[PDB]
From Swiss-Prot, chain A:
Its EC number is 5.3.3.2. Involved in the biosynthesis of isoprenoids. Catalyzes the 1,3-allylic rearrangement of the homoallylic substrate isopentenyl (IPP) to its allylic isomer, dimethylallyl diphosphate (DMAPP). PANTHER family: ISOPENTENYL-DIPHOSPHATE DELTA-ISOMERASE. Mg(2+) binds at E102. This is Isopentenyl-diphosphate delta-isomerase.
Amino acid sequence: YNSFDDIELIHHSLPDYDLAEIDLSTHFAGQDFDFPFYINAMGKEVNEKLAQVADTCGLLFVTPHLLLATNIGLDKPYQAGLQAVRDLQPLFLQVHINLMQELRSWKKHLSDYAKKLQLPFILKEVGFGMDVKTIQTAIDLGVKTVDISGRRSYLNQWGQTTAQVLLNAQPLMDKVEILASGGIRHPLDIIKALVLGAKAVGLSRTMLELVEQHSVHEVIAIVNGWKEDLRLIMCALNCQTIAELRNVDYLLYGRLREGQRQ
Amino acid sequence: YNSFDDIELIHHSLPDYDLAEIDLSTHFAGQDFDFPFYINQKGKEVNEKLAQVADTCGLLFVRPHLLLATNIGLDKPYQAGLQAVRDLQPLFLQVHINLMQELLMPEGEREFRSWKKHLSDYAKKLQLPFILKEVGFGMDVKTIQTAIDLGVKTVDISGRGRSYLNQWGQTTAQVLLNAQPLMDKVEILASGGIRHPLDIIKALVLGAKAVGLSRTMLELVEQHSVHEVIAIVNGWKEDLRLIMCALNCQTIAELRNVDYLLYGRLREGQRQ
Amino acid sequence: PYNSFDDIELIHHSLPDYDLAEIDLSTHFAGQDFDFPFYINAMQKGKEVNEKLAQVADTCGLLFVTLLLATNIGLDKPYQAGLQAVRDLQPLFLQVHINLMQELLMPEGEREFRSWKKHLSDYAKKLQLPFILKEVGFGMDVKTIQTAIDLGVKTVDISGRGRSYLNQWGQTTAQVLLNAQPLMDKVEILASGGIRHPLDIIKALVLGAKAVGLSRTMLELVEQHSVHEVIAIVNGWKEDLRLIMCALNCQTIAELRNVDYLLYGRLREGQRQ
Amino acid sequence: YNSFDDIELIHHSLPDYDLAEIDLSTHFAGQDFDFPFYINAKEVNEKLAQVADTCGLLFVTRPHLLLATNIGLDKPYQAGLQAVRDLQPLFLQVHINLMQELLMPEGEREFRSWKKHLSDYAKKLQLPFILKEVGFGMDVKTIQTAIDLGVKTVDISGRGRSYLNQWGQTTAQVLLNAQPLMDKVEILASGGIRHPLDIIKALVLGAKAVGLSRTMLELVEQHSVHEVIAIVNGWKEDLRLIMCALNCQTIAELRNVDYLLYGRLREGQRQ
């Protein structure tokens, strides 16, 4: 099951735009980007391979002329993140939470960043789906950008799904920047998350599967082709920019519709 | 999956009409037709066969008695379509939009700014009636509305009957349902995923003036002799009055007051 | 195989008010009191089956059509034929059947239907005995039921569903029962089609049918068991009816109308358009 | 199919509590308990009593053993007053197994007494008592009668010839149905509880406590007593863990947790 499968976008028959005028650019964490998707790193042979495709493809890469941001677990003290930032000069700091993966100081550390840190920073949930309450909390600390990342061992089906968390977070989007990740397989999933209102979409699982299957050159090729697919899809939806996608009509089916129809 | 399978017609137990008084005629593209369904590089053989059944069975087809219409892509200039009309003197012109088909085609159209221009020229300059036809993905309401605004009188809403995109578009029933608010502003024609006369009746109930068949017709000629296909087809005209008798409807138009129920995905998509 | 009764759940009642033996199974329709709320509808041989069916009805104390006896006639027959049936047999009532789709899907099936309404009008106008208008297999719609009401018909059997592409034409028994509820004060409703067991029977009764007729189920029974065993199974069904009714806390057939139920799936979908 | 699987709890990414702050205590039938789940019960009862005593759990049929005793409502008030006298339990549980008895060829056939018997307890018994359904789900009407009869605690025990063996309502469905009565009576949940997440779900739906039976029988059937004790004790940490992820400090606060309903359960709620 992938929640994006429960979403249908309304096709538009009479196109207004040439394929080449389609604008793929977006903005978050105080930065303009050429492309609305990016790469989150994973052994270390993998991450080198990924930094390679990001650089050639001109994509942000979240851990030379490579658009760079750094990640740190919120379990670490604030000084550790401040130092990561000083040493690396990333576009921004991303701090992640994995409650259930873990299952205290976390909110202390979070507090410390929101107030002290001068560079833009992002709070990232790690796959369990970030609930509205937590989104509101972050907003109240003055967090400007969150990665909403959604989906004994009777508990491992825990958490909300990506699409579902994106839908719930919709009322808050005029107050915070939303980033989606988790369960994104291809450019249609990407377009879906954007339609739902994410500023951009982080890729993880898919990228690793690609490098495990394809050489870096092949992946670079695949990823650049994905750029085309994005334009193609948006042409078909009659949208000339990334922002216009937020006006695309869509339909919910199955569990996703159920979840929104209580 | 076919979306018509998610529609249930309410049958009527005590009939008022005999099987032989049921009226099958309809009207669109400025023409009267006796029947509410019609037919849409070797290839050229299959089309000889289809034209044959059409002429014989009295169906529109898209032989001086053959009721013919001709098709052209909207990517062509208005002038090309006009040549077509002048050349073949068809009942009407059918202009197709196949955006997604083009986009997925390696050698396909890549620029579309002109499509709207071409469409405008037809609505305002073409004498003969024309139909704007979608090719397979389901014509959305916004497109329909624009057409209406440009002065288009008839549309074929043709819905769904890398590989991650192969389920793009809306289903036929679904597009007919969405289009219902505009059915008094433009003529709706149905096509895509029409298997049999029950699908035909369903499309008409939802409010289409008529229903085009394609795939089903290949399938038939692809496993029967013209003579035998003409048989099934004429017999479909008898399935139509039969179905209609049991729905207690005496004319095509009356089918729009047949009560029905929606189930599953089709109902889901209609109740957001 | 889909059966719409399976889309209905009855709300159990934990704390019983009644003893099992006081549960009353008696009902009333077409001007007759009957001991039980289910009856049998008959099938060239053929005759052999109907012999067996009549023997279980007689022994089990059940109404049998066509001993508690009623007669059936196709509505394509002229009224006088129905009249002579009543005169000759002295049945409890006359059941007149319509089978439109069945006639349509049949080569020889009489394709002229103009006379059915005429004949129905004739029976309403001339026939003293109560008579039932009975759909055959496809579900009687609210429009037909209302027309019956207008003609003076007091009882209908709404008999729902329980080339090939028309093989699933028509409404399911449960669905037709639900559609008919708003008319249940103006006409008596009988259910048939797709009744497999006493729980199906209870469900139909809850939905508001006065009684339910069995057809295919009876045929299946005599095909698998001796007549003795069928009699045993059927009398056992009586106890099942009381048992279920006890569990629901309903002491009479009429009280089943007050039983809470939930709808699921297609059946629920059918009521949430 | 288990009805709890149609319920999704809305979790909380950044908590407010540690696992040590989580209060697991509850109260019903006049008694404080340190834990919100308990055991419903011969050689197997032998073992189950040893797990309960050692784990500090209520045990409904060892001076430290928190004991309660069960009796069928088909018994006259005399037999139940005896039970209390003989065993000095924390409370008496009176069960109603209507459908079970109807499907028993030797089972009860008269029932008019049951409501009489219930009212006697309601009038003659000093010791608190619980009215317990056995497996088929206690319906709103029956609960309302208990209320009017003065009964203060019920176990709503839900689902979780053969055409009848899906009779009754599921545990979660009966919980949902009973909600409007949760300020008028104590609701105990049982029937198809597999693990601590089912426990939490029942508590969130508003039960004061969750009773286990089948699972317990399986555990002492697929394990040794000591293991079972380790198993149940581990369940206690799971409860705090879930409650932390849900950001709840007490059992009570569970009723403010947000949830979504799917499938059959949602369908039953939208008629």
